[PDB]
Write a protein that binds this ligand. Structure first.
Ligand SMILES: COc1c(C)cnc(Cn2cnc3c(Cl)nc(N)nc32)c1C
Ligand SMILES: [Mg+2]
Ligand SMILES: [Mg+2]
Length: 214
């Protein structure tokens, strides 16, 4: 039907849709780097809210805790990365994030078509899109102090959606929910997540807590 006035559909910027298709279809085995890139993004988000609060302590009224949580769910086949950083506004989700990423995306594609491999995506500032190395659908729940709670979602293919979230309020931060591909379930294992974290994302300025399944 798609007669839901609460859900809006947008097309990715041409360069970004291209990058996503390239990431999805390239044969690349070193997929674990996706978790490092997302943990780096959360650390950046937490640095920003911590820095803003030095001049305005009321920015932490929405939560003093500053941490990162990793939550595998074997039943739903999802790996969720939660942080209490600055969050994202509606403008960020629709306009600003893609605009700021245009230049880095183009450059990254040149590097790839030259020699560089996918693991350097973070050097171009577009590491988030490495999530689709392992995820067929990505759902992002976010809350910025200056806006409402929103839900961003995309299964690639050139389009993404944005709606006002109706679920549990978070207070402030971001939840990245990775709906994992059938053959990428190794990233729901506790020993595997530990290895990847200790490898790269290890000197992070905030506590990283792994939720073990029951
Ligand atoms: C909506 O999904 C994203 C898109 C399409 C592009 N980049 C980022 C990374 N990213 C940007 N700001 C972010 C903040 Cl405040 N936090 C986190 N954890 N990631 C962020 C995200 C999450
Ligand atoms: Mg595609
Ligand atoms: Mg906690």
């Amino acid at each position: 039907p798609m007669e839901e006035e609460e859900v809006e559909t947008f097309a990715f910027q041409a360069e970004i849709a291209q990058l996503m298709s390239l990431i999805i279809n390239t044969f690349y085995s070193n997929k674990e780097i996706f978790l490092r890139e997302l943990i780096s993004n959360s650390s950046d988000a937490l640095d920003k809210i911590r820095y803003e609060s030095l001049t305005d302590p009321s920015k932490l009224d929405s939560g003093k805790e500053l941490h990162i949580n990793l939550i595998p769910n074997k039943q739903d086949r999802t790996l969720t990365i939660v942080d209490t950083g600055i969050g994202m506004t509606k403008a960020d989700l629709i306009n600003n994030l893609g605009t700021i990423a245009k230049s880095g995306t183009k450059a990254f594609m040149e590097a790839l078509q030259a020699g560089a491999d996918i693991s350097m995506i973070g050097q171009f500032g577009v590491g988030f899109y490495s999530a689709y190395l392992v995820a067929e659908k990505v759902t992002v729940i976010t809350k910025h102090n200056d806006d409402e709670q929103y839900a961003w979602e995309s299964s690639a293919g050139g389009s993404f959606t944005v709606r006002t979230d109706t679920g549990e309020p978070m207070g402030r931060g971001t939840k990245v929910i990775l709906h994992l591909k059938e053959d990428q379930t190794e990233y729901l294992e506790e020993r595997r997540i530990k290895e990847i974290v200790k490898k790269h994302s290890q000197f992070i300025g905030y506590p990283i807590t792994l939720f073990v399944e029951k």
